[PDB]
Nucleic acid binder design. Structure first.
Ligand SMILES: [Mg+2]
Ligand SMILES: [Mg+2]
Ligand SMILES: [Mg+2]
Ligand SMILES: [Mg+2]
Ligand SMILES: [Mg+2]
Ligand SMILES: [Mg+2]
Ligand SMILES: [Mg+2]
Ligand SMILES: [Mg+2]
Ligand SMILES: [Mg+2]
Ligand SMILES: [Mg+2]
Ligand SMILES: [Mg+2]
Ligand SMILES: [Mg+2]
Ligand SMILES: [Mg+2]
Ligand SMILES: [Mg+2]
Ligand SMILES: [Mg+2]
Ligand SMILES: [Mg+2]
Ligand SMILES: [Mg+2]
Ligand SMILES: [Mg+2]
Ligand SMILES: [Mg+2]
Ligand SMILES: [Mg+2]
Ligand SMILES: [Mg+2]
Ligand SMILES: [Mg+2]
Ligand SMILES: [Mg+2]
Ligand SMILES: [Mg+2]
Ligand SMILES: [Mg+2]
Ligand SMILES: [Mg+2]
Ligand SMILES: [Mg+2]
Ligand SMILES: [Mg+2]
Ligand SMILES: [Mg+2]
Ligand SMILES: [Mg+2]
Ligand SMILES: [Mg+2]
Ligand SMILES: [Mg+2]
Ligand SMILES: [Mg+2]
Ligand SMILES: [Mg+2]
Ligand SMILES: [Mg+2]
Ligand SMILES: [Mg+2]
Ligand SMILES: [Mg+2]
Ligand SMILES: [Mg+2]
Ligand SMILES: [Mg+2]
Ligand SMILES: [Mg+2]
Ligand SMILES: [Mg+2]
Ligand SMILES: [Mg+2]
Ligand SMILES: [Mg+2]
Ligand SMILES: [Mg+2]
Ligand SMILES: [Mg+2]
Ligand SMILES: [Mg+2]
Ligand SMILES: [Mg+2]
Ligand SMILES: [Mg+2]
Ligand SMILES: [Mg+2]
Ligand SMILES: [Mg+2]
Ligand SMILES: [Mg+2]
Ligand SMILES: [Mg+2]
Ligand SMILES: [Mg+2]
Ligand SMILES: [Mg+2]
Ligand SMILES: [Mg+2]
Ligand SMILES: [Mg+2]
Ligand SMILES: [Mg+2]
Ligand SMILES: [Mg+2]
Ligand SMILES: [Mg+2]
Ligand SMILES: [Mg+2]
Ligand SMILES: [Mg+2]
Ligand SMILES: [Mg+2]
Ligand SMILES: [Mg+2]
Ligand SMILES: [Mg+2]
Ligand SMILES: [Mg+2]
Ligand SMILES: [Mg+2]
Ligand SMILES: [Mg+2]
Ligand SMILES: [Mg+2]
Ligand SMILES: [Mg+2]
Ligand SMILES: [Mg+2]
Ligand SMILES: [Mg+2]
Ligand SMILES: [Mg+2]
Ligand SMILES: [Mg+2]
Ligand SMILES: [Mg+2]
Ligand SMILES: [Mg+2]
Ligand SMILES: [Mg+2]
Ligand SMILES: [Mg+2]
Ligand SMILES: [Mg+2]
Ligand SMILES: [Mg+2]
Ligand SMILES: [Mg+2]
Ligand SMILES: [Mg+2]
Ligand SMILES: [Mg+2]
Ligand SMILES: [Mg+2]
Ligand SMILES: [Mg+2]
Ligand SMILES: [Mg+2]
Ligand SMILES: [Mg+2]
Ligand SMILES: [Mg+2]
Ligand SMILES: [Mg+2]
Ligand SMILES: [Mg+2]
Ligand SMILES: [Mg+2]
Ligand SMILES: [Mg+2]
Ligand SMILES: [Mg+2]
Ligand SMILES: [Mg+2]
Ligand SMILES: [Mg+2]
Ligand SMILES: [Mg+2]
Ligand SMILES: [Mg+2]
Ligand SMILES: [Mg+2]
Ligand SMILES: [Mg+2]
Ligand SMILES: [Mg+2]
Ligand SMILES: [Mg+2]
Ligand SMILES: [Mg+2]
Ligand SMILES: [Mg+2]
Ligand SMILES: [Mg+2]
Ligand SMILES: [Mg+2]
Ligand SMILES: [Mg+2]
Ligand SMILES: [Mg+2]
Ligand SMILES: [Mg+2]
Ligand SMILES: [Mg+2]
Ligand SMILES: [Mg+2]
Ligand SMILES: [Mg+2]
Ligand SMILES: [Mg+2]
Ligand SMILES: [Mg+2]
Ligand SMILES: [Mg+2]
Ligand SMILES: [Mg+2]
Ligand SMILES: [Mg+2]
Ligand SMILES: [Mg+2]
Ligand SMILES: [Mg+2]
Ligand SMILES: [Mg+2]
Ligand SMILES: [Mg+2]
Ligand SMILES: [Mg+2]
Ligand SMILES: [Mg+2]
Ligand SMILES: [Mg+2]
Ligand SMILES: [Mg+2]
Ligand SMILES: [Mg+2]
Ligand SMILES: [Mg+2]
Ligand SMILES: [Mg+2]
Ligand SMILES: [Mg+2]
Ligand SMILES: [Mg+2]
Ligand SMILES: [Mg+2]
Ligand SMILES: [Mg+2]
Ligand SMILES: [Mg+2]
Ligand SMILES: [Mg+2]
Ligand SMILES: [Mg+2]
Ligand SMILES: [Mg+2]
Ligand SMILES: [Mg+2]
Ligand SMILES: [Mg+2]
Ligand SMILES: [Mg+2]
Ligand SMILES: [Mg+2]
Ligand SMILES: [Mg+2]
Ligand SMILES: [Mg+2]
Ligand SMILES: [Mg+2]
Ligand SMILES: [Mg+2]
Ligand SMILES: [Mg+2]
Ligand SMILES: [Mg+2]
Ligand SMILES: [Mg+2]
Ligand SMILES: [Mg+2]
Ligand SMILES: [Mg+2]
Ligand SMILES: [Mg+2]
Ligand SMILES: [Mg+2]
Ligand SMILES: [Mg+2]
Ligand SMILES: [Mg+2]
Ligand SMILES: [Mg+2]
Ligand SMILES: [Mg+2]
Ligand SMILES: [Mg+2]
Ligand SMILES: [Mg+2]
Ligand SMILES: [Mg+2]
Ligand SMILES: [Mg+2]
Ligand SMILES: [Mg+2]
Ligand SMILES: [Mg+2]
Ligand SMILES: [Mg+2]
Ligand SMILES: [Mg+2]
Ligand SMILES: [Mg+2]
Ligand SMILES: [Mg+2]
Ligand SMILES: [Mg+2]
Ligand SMILES: [Mg+2]
Ligand SMILES: [Mg+2]
Ligand SMILES: [Mg+2]
Ligand SMILES: [Mg+2]
Ligand SMILES: [Mg+2]
Ligand SMILES: [Mg+2]
Ligand SMILES: [Mg+2]
Ligand SMILES: [Mg+2]
Ligand SMILES: [Mg+2]
Ligand SMILES: [Mg+2]
Ligand SMILES: [Mg+2]
Ligand SMILES: [Mg+2]
Ligand SMILES: [Mg+2]
Ligand SMILES: [Mg+2]
Ligand SMILES: [Mg+2]
Ligand SMILES: [Mg+2]
Ligand SMILES: [Mg+2]
Ligand SMILES: [Mg+2]
Ligand SMILES: [Mg+2]
Ligand SMILES: [Mg+2]
Ligand SMILES: [Mg+2]
Ligand SMILES: [Mg+2]
Ligand SMILES: [Mg+2]
Ligand SMILES: [Mg+2]
Ligand SMILES: [Mg+2]
Ligand SMILES: [Mg+2]
Ligand SMILES: [Mg+2]
Ligand SMILES: [Mg+2]
Ligand SMILES: [Mg+2]
Ligand SMILES: [Mg+2]
Ligand SMILES: [Mg+2]
Ligand SMILES: [Mg+2]
Ligand SMILES: [Mg+2]
Ligand SMILES: [Mg+2]
Ligand SMILES: [Mg+2]
Ligand SMILES: [Mg+2]
Ligand SMILES: [Mg+2]
Ligand SMILES: [Mg+2]
Ligand SMILES: [Mg+2]
Ligand SMILES: [Mg+2]
Ligand SMILES: [Mg+2]
Ligand SMILES: [Mg+2]
Ligand SMILES: [Mg+2]
Ligand SMILES: [Mg+2]
Ligand SMILES: [Mg+2]
Ligand SMILES: [Mg+2]
Ligand SMILES: [Mg+2]
Ligand SMILES: [Mg+2]
Ligand SMILES: [Mg+2]
Ligand SMILES: [Mg+2]
Ligand SMILES: [Mg+2]
Ligand SMILES: [Mg+2]
Ligand SMILES: [Mg+2]
Ligand SMILES: [Mg+2]
Ligand SMILES: [Mg+2]
Ligand SMILES: [Mg+2]
Ligand SMILES: [Mg+2]
Ligand SMILES: [Mg+2]
Ligand SMILES: [Mg+2]
Ligand SMILES: [Mg+2]
Ligand SMILES: [Mg+2]
Ligand SMILES: [Mg+2]
Ligand SMILES: [Mg+2]
Ligand SMILES: [Mg+2]
Ligand SMILES: [Mg+2]
Ligand SMILES: [Mg+2]
Ligand SMILES: [Mg+2]
Ligand SMILES: [Mg+2]
Ligand SMILES: [Mg+2]
Ligand SMILES: [Mg+2]
Ligand SMILES: [Mg+2]
Ligand SMILES: [Mg+2]
Ligand SMILES: [Mg+2]
Ligand SMILES: [Mg+2]
Ligand SMILES: [Mg+2]
Ligand SMILES: [Mg+2]
Ligand SMILES: [Mg+2]
Ligand SMILES: [Mg+2]
Ligand SMILES: [Mg+2]
Ligand SMILES: [Mg+2]
Ligand SMILES: [Mg+2]
Ligand SMILES: [Mg+2]
Ligand SMILES: [Mg+2]
Ligand SMILES: [Mg+2]
Ligand SMILES: [Mg+2]
Ligand SMILES: [Mg+2]
Ligand SMILES: [Mg+2]
Ligand SMILES: [Mg+2]
Ligand SMILES: [Mg+2]
Ligand SMILES: [Mg+2]
Ligand SMILES: [Mg+2]
Ligand SMILES: [Mg+2]
Ligand SMILES: [Mg+2]
Ligand SMILES: [Mg+2]
Ligand SMILES: [Mg+2]
Ligand SMILES: [Mg+2]
Ligand SMILES: [Mg+2]
Ligand SMILES: [Mg+2]
Ligand SMILES: [Mg+2]
Ligand SMILES: [Mg+2]
Ligand SMILES: [Mg+2]
Ligand SMILES: [Mg+2]
Ligand SMILES: [Mg+2]
Ligand SMILES: [Mg+2]
Ligand SMILES: [Mg+2]
Ligand SMILES: [Mg+2]
Ligand SMILES: [Mg+2]
Lengths: 49, 272
RNA sequence: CGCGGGGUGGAGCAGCCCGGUAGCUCGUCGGGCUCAUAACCCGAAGGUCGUCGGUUCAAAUCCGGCCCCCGCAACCA
RNA sequence: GGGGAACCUGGGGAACUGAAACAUCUCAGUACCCAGAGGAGAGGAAAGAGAAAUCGACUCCCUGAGUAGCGGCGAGCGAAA
RNA sequence: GGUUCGUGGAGCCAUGGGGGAAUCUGGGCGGACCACCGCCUAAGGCUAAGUACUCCGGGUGACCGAUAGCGCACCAGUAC
RNA sequence: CUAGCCCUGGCCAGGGUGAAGCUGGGGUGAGACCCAGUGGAGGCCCGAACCGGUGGGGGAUGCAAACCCCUCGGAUGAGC
RNA sequence: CGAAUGCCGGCAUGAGUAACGAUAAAGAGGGUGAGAAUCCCUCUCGCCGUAAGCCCAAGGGUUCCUACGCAAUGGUCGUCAGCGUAGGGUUAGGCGGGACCUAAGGUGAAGCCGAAAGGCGUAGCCGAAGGGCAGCCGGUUAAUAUUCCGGCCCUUCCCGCAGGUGCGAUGGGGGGACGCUCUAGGCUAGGGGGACCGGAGCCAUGGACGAGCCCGGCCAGAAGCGCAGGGUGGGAGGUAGGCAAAUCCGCCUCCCAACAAGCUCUGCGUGGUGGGGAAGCCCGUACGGGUGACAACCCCCCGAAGCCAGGGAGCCAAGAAAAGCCUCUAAGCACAACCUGCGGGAACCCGUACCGCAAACCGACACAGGUGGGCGGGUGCAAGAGCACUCAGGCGCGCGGGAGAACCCUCGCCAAGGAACUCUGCAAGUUGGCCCCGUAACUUCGGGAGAAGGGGUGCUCCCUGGGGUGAUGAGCCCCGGGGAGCCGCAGUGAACAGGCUCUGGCGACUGUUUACCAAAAACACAGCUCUCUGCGAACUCGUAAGAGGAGGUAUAGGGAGCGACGCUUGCCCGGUGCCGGAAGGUCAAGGGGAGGGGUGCAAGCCCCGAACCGAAGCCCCGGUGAACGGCGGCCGUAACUAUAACGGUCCUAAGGUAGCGAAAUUCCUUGUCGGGUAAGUUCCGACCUGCACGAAAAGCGUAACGACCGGAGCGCUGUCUCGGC
RNA sequence: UGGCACCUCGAUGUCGGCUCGUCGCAUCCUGGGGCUGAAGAAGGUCCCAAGGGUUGGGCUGUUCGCCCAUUAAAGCGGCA
């Protein structure tokens, strides 16, 4: 029953990435409230090598 | 001609493929004068704009010569005839003395080893390219420029052929494959002859499959969709149009002329 | 049994909406033409305008009931 | 060059609702988007107001006034001296 | 488009398009318009103060008192 | 996730039928054509993986927010 | 505050009830321990084996190993653990990425466009399981190893010495470079054998010390050699092309060479040399360690879908780029510089534990689901990755114990009958592999065909014909034919393996579909017609720029409808649509001002406003039906009745032709006749008063296909009589 | 078959079949019995009386119904 969540590092760092948010003017605003709100994680955690 | 197949399978009972007799000796293309990575993909930046396009065999573009006036005088021996998968018509690979090789959308009657050339000088004969106005009024030609030095454009679709009717001051009258009569500038080069493989029009795809090979995706009829999707759709149990036949977008499809009126192009044309 | 149209000499239609007279084609009847019939020519006759009541000075024609004929409707159940 | 809770100017700019239906009208130049400004910003020394031959840059508060007016003259909106 | 002004007798201040002056006996305004009579000088620019806000610091409360009070008095914008 | 398309890779046991072409023979003025043999075609056939999901039964606070079992469809293609 | 299926919290009821997550299965003796069916050990037993076993990628992130433990988590127990605490553990120039390349796509100097945010976009840059690039076999740890160590073998950089040479670019050229299907010639992994070689041992219960039983008979390896095969003509003249230049490529001409030889480059053997190396027996918690050995390490046969590989043949749908790498010359420099030897140095960053078809990934769970790549042994069954059993290896699924009721599930069998069951033979049966007979209508000649329906199939001895490896013989494998004979109820002896005919409707056909109630007669489809489009095409996305169309150009693009194929596709443009009409009527801003008005003492300043000139559209004239659409009513007549070819009359734009027809269309209607059945509202054939068929929303047919829907029959059956065990 | 709409629209699942029945009598059969246009045998009709029986098939989703073959008979109706 193949589900909705199929993990993929690149796909995730490239989609909701920090540099991604910066690229777009809407991305910026996200962070902006994420900061204002006082979140410990602005972007999702996902690493590599 | 065209080969037919014994019906040892349905979808074969009617299939026919163009024979490749004059396909000279080839198969592989000249890797200099072409090919070029051909950017395949059925739409513009983003959305799709030409429905039912997609998939279907890989393809390498053949950068063919469309302005022979480049090398006036310099002649060429017709090296061979190749299959180009980007155009109904066949093509000719020629060797100029100059040492430069080019491909020329090949005309009917064209023979390997035979010779040809371009320029005012040139003799009126299959393959030679001349400024329209230096052509014998009434001699059919193919590959024709529209406005001088702006490349070839009319007639280049297999069996296609334009014909001189007469000339006026600068222009010469031409009857394009559309029966339409038009005037073109004398300076526009045209290469005498008449394209070839005039049979293409007689191939029978045979099976839904082959239409995908070419790269043509299944085409949904309007009367199948739903109102939201198309002007022809709903109530079902089949149904007549119920309004003048329309396009997905709304314009009448049978009749309604679309050539814009106030065009500059007119004043140079006289009916289709 | 809802809604709409209609029923005029032997046949098929018009007249009615804007009430006072009922017209047309065919057929029917007499005369002619032809050896004779048909065709054709001349002339003629022929109708409670479904039916019962009502409106008016007067009704096919305007109003109402009854009857018959045709068209559409009879759905969510 | 980017940031800053609100406040500020400008460039854009809705709809639900109200009208006991809805279409002009209202909700509103409101929400939200964008750019810029700074501890403020805006405005500011008259081609002004208005009837007094009068006042005298701008800004902000109270009155004037829910007046004058505006308005499917409906719902409602609403100054300045 | 703005003004109370939704074409209305619609002026005034802005303009997108078109036409297109003048230099002070020149030129705008006083709610169509004209004549009187007044008012003011447009098409460059700057300017404190009084005003608004409160992330931050402090003071008070006929304010709350751990289901209340900020979502968090507790390592919460966390765990999840 | 799901739909489509673009770039680059991968996958499809084993069987079966046997097209065109060739070669020889036959035939004819020359042919078409007729035989064998070779040959290997095809949204061709039987059938695993693989992709499906036809009928029936179970499951129905499940093993499971779509599953299990038997049984079927396609399987070099508009294939996965 | 009692109520808002109110909000938060707590605790009840059902209930000691249903459950405890695949019916692959367990049993005993020792151990340990406060306490064990549940943990360690050993012996039996069962299950997986194209796996339920190995290796890799993603994802997960310490779950790896070890020492202590058991409150909680493990659907029971727990002395165990993937759980708690603590400590170890993941070692490279050559493996994978980065210091190399380019794909789609991103981004993007120029430059374009946008009210702002921002949208495009040339070169370049980023971008990979694609390209390019230097390593194998062993030993070692509790836990890492193509990294540590051993043996053998390579790769670039910098410097140095010796020797060649016009050396040299981000530029020119070559190459890299490429499809699908079918294939050859050799090899290899891998496997089967052996009368031969090496081995601890065993003769058990009647028999055998036998060319017996049983275990094992290899792996890596530079140079040079061989044995396969891939690559590539050498010269000389010219030269106007490869956007500078070339001695290079590309062209012409002439010499030699020519299904080769030569030079090259792989693979495969062999190779100096190095390493491994059962069974069984002995210790032994664990699960390793000796011994076997100075182990032997040889011969045949089968053999890849893997290698040689850019090999070959055939076909059309005609099959990436860039760098490395060669070569050619530019500025330069020619004491440089490259090229070749040989020495000596230099050689970074990140990953490397462990699970990995799963109790460690995606499914809230130790969830009977889902997850890409490679290896995946042996025997048999015609083949195979199938089926049955079994190696290596790994498991008995984290609740058990007894009983032996109903009832449910899954399964087996059955008297006689056989579909009488039922909406329907739904379900279940029947049939099923292979070899050989033998097969009808109809047909688009292919098909229908595995049509149907038959027989054979085991084992023993004899005779004999062909293949491949040796060599033309031996053995070893692989294809046959004939002749006798044995035994069972039965010989594809178990497991995998069509039930079959006849005749209708729909769709031609293989395909698609409502992920999670519909797979269909619906969609698609080749094909046919219509209509737009002459190229800065038409159409589509976009405010624009730009882009798709297309690096296409009417044998092509877009839009629509029908929908293989055959035979056909009637009549009507009155209304609507679309096409054509340089005339008319109407027609808005605008032009034009007849003439009127408000003001001033006036010059003037301001307003109106009729002619008449003024588009497209509309009206008006024509066309057009595989454009939207439409395609009559009433009376009357013939040698008996009946009907009605014929007629009369209204009405129209015209008044349904062919062909079909109680139909996927028929209301009345189980229409009326025939056919099938003992009996037939359905079914097949007819007839036509077609409520309300009918010609590309096609008409009527049609071979072949349909997990489509309907009606017969044969076979066989627990579907049923009617249940039973 | 309807009319009314009274409880139920925070839900009272509708035809038919199968299974399991049970009740009524306005008795289909078998028991009594009066009449009779009752010789007999058969019937007709009406009165008592359900105690117990009340078949199997073909066509239809059918209930009903039409048939085939029998029978002592092949009852009708209530129980959402
Ligand atoms: Mg989820
Ligand atoms: Mg992805
Ligand atoms: Mg090629
Ligand atoms: Mg290239
Ligand atoms: Mg984009
Ligand atoms: Mg493909
Ligand atoms: Mg098409
Ligand atoms: Mg279609
Ligand atoms: Mg539809
Ligand atoms: Mg849409
Ligand atoms: Mg629409
Ligand atoms: Mg429609
Ligand atoms: Mg319909
Ligand atoms: Mg024409
Ligand atoms: Mg009524
Ligand atoms: Mg009458
Ligand atoms: Mg007479
Ligand atoms: Mg007469
Ligand atoms: Mg009268
Ligand atoms: Mg009267
Ligand atoms: Mg309705
Ligand atoms: Mg209904
Ligand atoms: Mg800022
Ligand atoms: Mg604003
Ligand atoms: Mg609204
Ligand atoms: Mg309202
Ligand atoms: Mg409303
Ligand atoms: Mg307002
Ligand atoms: Mg200020
Ligand atoms: Mg002031
Ligand atoms: Mg208010
Ligand atoms: Mg108004
Ligand atoms: Mg306004
Ligand atoms: Mg004024
Ligand atoms: Mg202006
Ligand atoms: Mg003045
Ligand atoms: Mg002004
Ligand atoms: Mg003014
Ligand atoms: Mg005034
Ligand atoms: Mg003033
Ligand atoms: Mg100034
Ligand atoms: Mg200031
Ligand atoms: Mg404070
Ligand atoms: Mg304090
Ligand atoms: Mg208190
Ligand atoms: Mg709180
Ligand atoms: Mg706080
Ligand atoms: Mg605190
Ligand atoms: Mg998927
Ligand atoms: Mg799809
Ligand atoms: Mg792919
Ligand atoms: Mg064959
Ligand atoms: Mg010959
Ligand atoms: Mg043959
Ligand atoms: Mg042949
Ligand atoms: Mg062969
Ligand atoms: Mg197939
Ligand atoms: Mg098939
Ligand atoms: Mg299958
Ligand atoms: Mg595989
Ligand atoms: Mg299923
Ligand atoms: Mg079920
Ligand atoms: Mg159930
Ligand atoms: Mg099948
Ligand atoms: Mg198959
Ligand atoms: Mg209360
Ligand atoms: Mg209970
Ligand atoms: Mg119980
Ligand atoms: Mg459960
Ligand atoms: Mg229980
Ligand atoms: Mg369990
Ligand atoms: Mg035990
Ligand atoms: Mg024990
Ligand atoms: Mg156990
Ligand atoms: Mg054990
Ligand atoms: Mg032992
Ligand atoms: Mg096996
Ligand atoms: Mg597999
Ligand atoms: Mg398991
Ligand atoms: Mg990982
Ligand atoms: Mg996890
Ligand atoms: Mg941990
Ligand atoms: Mg240990
Ligand atoms: Mg322990
Ligand atoms: Mg515990
Ligand atoms: Mg547990
Ligand atoms: Mg559990
Ligand atoms: Mg426990
Ligand atoms: Mg475990
Ligand atoms: Mg632990
Ligand atoms: Mg090393
Ligand atoms: Mg690795
Ligand atoms: Mg470096
Ligand atoms: Mg570095
Ligand atoms: Mg580079
Ligand atoms: Mg890089
Ligand atoms: Mg690119
Ligand atoms: Mg930029
Ligand atoms: Mg961009
Ligand atoms: Mg790059
Ligand atoms: Mg490659
Ligand atoms: Mg690579
Ligand atoms: Mg490389
Ligand atoms: Mg490497
Ligand atoms: Mg080697
Ligand atoms: Mg390990
Ligand atoms: Mg190792
Ligand atoms: Mg080493
Ligand atoms: Mg080397
Ligand atoms: Mg030197
Ligand atoms: Mg030298
Ligand atoms: Mg050189
Ligand atoms: Mg030089
Ligand atoms: Mg260079
Ligand atoms: Mg170089
Ligand atoms: Mg190059
Ligand atoms: Mg090729
Ligand atoms: Mg081979
Ligand atoms: Mg070997
Ligand atoms: Mg071997
Ligand atoms: Mg073998
Ligand atoms: Mg063996
Ligand atoms: Mg052996
Ligand atoms: Mg061996
Ligand atoms: Mg032996
Ligand atoms: Mg031997
Ligand atoms: Mg021995
Ligand atoms: Mg020995
Ligand atoms: Mg021995
Ligand atoms: Mg010994
Ligand atoms: Mg011994
Ligand atoms: Mg011995
Ligand atoms: Mg013995
Ligand atoms: Mg042995
Ligand atoms: Mg042996
Ligand atoms: Mg080996
Ligand atoms: Mg070796
Ligand atoms: Mg040469
Ligand atoms: Mg030369
Ligand atoms: Mg040159
Ligand atoms: Mg040059
Ligand atoms: Mg060679
Ligand atoms: Mg070699
Ligand atoms: Mg080697
Ligand atoms: Mg060697
Ligand atoms: Mg050794
Ligand atoms: Mg050993
Ligand atoms: Mg050893
Ligand atoms: Mg011990
Ligand atoms: Mg032991
Ligand atoms: Mg030893
Ligand atoms: Mg020893
Ligand atoms: Mg071989
Ligand atoms: Mg292979
Ligand atoms: Mg091969
Ligand atoms: Mg290869
Ligand atoms: Mg090849
Ligand atoms: Mg070769
Ligand atoms: Mg120089
Ligand atoms: Mg040097
Ligand atoms: Mg060197
Ligand atoms: Mg060295
Ligand atoms: Mg090193
Ligand atoms: Mg490791
Ligand atoms: Mg590892
Ligand atoms: Mg595990
Ligand atoms: Mg593993
Ligand atoms: Mg799996
Ligand atoms: Mg796997
Ligand atoms: Mg595993
Ligand atoms: Mg476990
Ligand atoms: Mg977990
Ligand atoms: Mg478990
Ligand atoms: Mg699982
Ligand atoms: Mg899990
Ligand atoms: Mg899948
Ligand atoms: Mg899978
Ligand atoms: Mg194998
Ligand atoms: Mg064996
Ligand atoms: Mg096997
Ligand atoms: Mg056997
Ligand atoms: Mg087999
Ligand atoms: Mg298996
Ligand atoms: Mg098995
Ligand atoms: Mg064995
Ligand atoms: Mg084992
Ligand atoms: Mg495992
Ligand atoms: Mg065990
Ligand atoms: Mg269990
Ligand atoms: Mg386990
Ligand atoms: Mg038995
Ligand atoms: Mg049996
Ligand atoms: Mg029986
Ligand atoms: Mg029997
Ligand atoms: Mg039977
Ligand atoms: Mg029978
Ligand atoms: Mg039956
Ligand atoms: Mg029956
Ligand atoms: Mg029955
Ligand atoms: Mg049936
Ligand atoms: Mg069945
Ligand atoms: Mg059988
Ligand atoms: Mg059988
Ligand atoms: Mg035949
Ligand atoms: Mg048979
Ligand atoms: Mg048989
Ligand atoms: Mg035997
Ligand atoms: Mg003999
Ligand atoms: Mg023999
Ligand atoms: Mg032999
Ligand atoms: Mg061999
Ligand atoms: Mg034999
Ligand atoms: Mg005997
Ligand atoms: Mg026998
Ligand atoms: Mg026998
Ligand atoms: Mg068998
Ligand atoms: Mg058999
Ligand atoms: Mg069997
Ligand atoms: Mg079987
Ligand atoms: Mg079968
Ligand atoms: Mg059929
Ligand atoms: Mg039918
Ligand atoms: Mg179909
Ligand atoms: Mg058809
Ligand atoms: Mg569909
Ligand atoms: Mg599907
Ligand atoms: Mg569905
Ligand atoms: Mg389904
Ligand atoms: Mg299907
Ligand atoms: Mg057609
Ligand atoms: Mg547009
Ligand atoms: Mg088209
Ligand atoms: Mg077209
Ligand atoms: Mg259709
Ligand atoms: Mg059709
Ligand atoms: Mg018409
Ligand atoms: Mg018309
Ligand atoms: Mg007309
Ligand atoms: Mg027109
Ligand atoms: Mg005017
Ligand atoms: Mg005017
Ligand atoms: Mg005046
Ligand atoms: Mg006056
Ligand atoms: Mg004035
Ligand atoms: Mg006009
Ligand atoms: Mg009009
Ligand atoms: Mg009709
Ligand atoms: Mg009929
Ligand atoms: Mg019938
Ligand atoms: Mg019929
Ligand atoms: Mg029918
Ligand atoms: Mg009958
Ligand atoms: Mg029957
Ligand atoms: Mg009948
Ligand atoms: Mg029809
Ligand atoms: Mg019709
Ligand atoms: Mg027609
Ligand atoms: Mg039609
Ligand atoms: Mg038909
Ligand atoms: Mg048919
Ligand atoms: Mg199909
Ligand atoms: Mg009632
Ligand atoms: Mg209700
Ligand atoms: Mg309730
Ligand atoms: Mg309820
Ligand atoms: Mg029922
Ligand atoms: Mg009684
Ligand atoms: Mg009696
Ligand atoms: Mg009966
Ligand atoms: Mg039936
Ligand atoms: Mg009853």
């Amino acid at each position: 029953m193949k589900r909705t969540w199929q993990p993929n590092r690149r796909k995730r760092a490239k989609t909701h990435g920090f540099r991604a948010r910066m690229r777009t003017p809407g991305g910026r605003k996200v962070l902006k409230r994420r900061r204002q709100k006082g979140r410990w994680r602005l972007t999702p955690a996902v690493r590599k090598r | 001609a065209v080969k037919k197949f014994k019906p040892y399978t349905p979808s074969r009972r009617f299939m026919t493929v163009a024979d490749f007799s004059e396909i000279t000796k080839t198969e592989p293309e000249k890797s200099l004068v072409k090919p070029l990575k051909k950017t395949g993909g059925r739409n513009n930046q983003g959305r799709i704009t030409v429905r039912f396009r997609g998939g279907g065999h890989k393809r390498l573009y053949r950068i063919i010569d469309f302005k022979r006036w480049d090398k006036v005088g310099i002649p060429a021996k017709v090296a061979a005839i190749e299959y180009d998968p980007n155009r109904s018509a066949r093509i000719a690979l020629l060797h100029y003395v100059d040492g430069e090789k080019r491909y020329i959308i090949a005309p009917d009657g064209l023979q390997v080893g035979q010779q040809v050339v371009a320029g005012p000088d040139a003799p009126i004969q299959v393959g030679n390219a001349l400024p329209l106005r230096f052509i014998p009024v009434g001699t059919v030609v193919h590959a024709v420029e529209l406005e001088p030095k702006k490349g070839a454009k009319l007639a280049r679709a297999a069996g296609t052929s334009a014909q001189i009717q007469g000339r006026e001051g600068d222009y010469v009258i031409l009857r394009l494959p559309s029966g339409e009569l038009r005037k073109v500038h004398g300076e526009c080069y045209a290469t005498v002859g008449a394209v070839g493989n005039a049979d293409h029009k007689n191939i029978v795809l045979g099976k839904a499959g082959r239409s995908r090979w070419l790269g043509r995706r299944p085409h949904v009829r309007g009367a199948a969709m739903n109102p939201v999707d198309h002007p022809h759709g709903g109530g079902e149990g089949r149904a007549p149009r119920g309004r003048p036949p329309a396009s997905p977008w709304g314009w009448q499809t049978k009749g309604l002329k679309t050539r814009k009126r106030r065009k500059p192009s007119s004043r140079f044309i006289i009916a289709r």
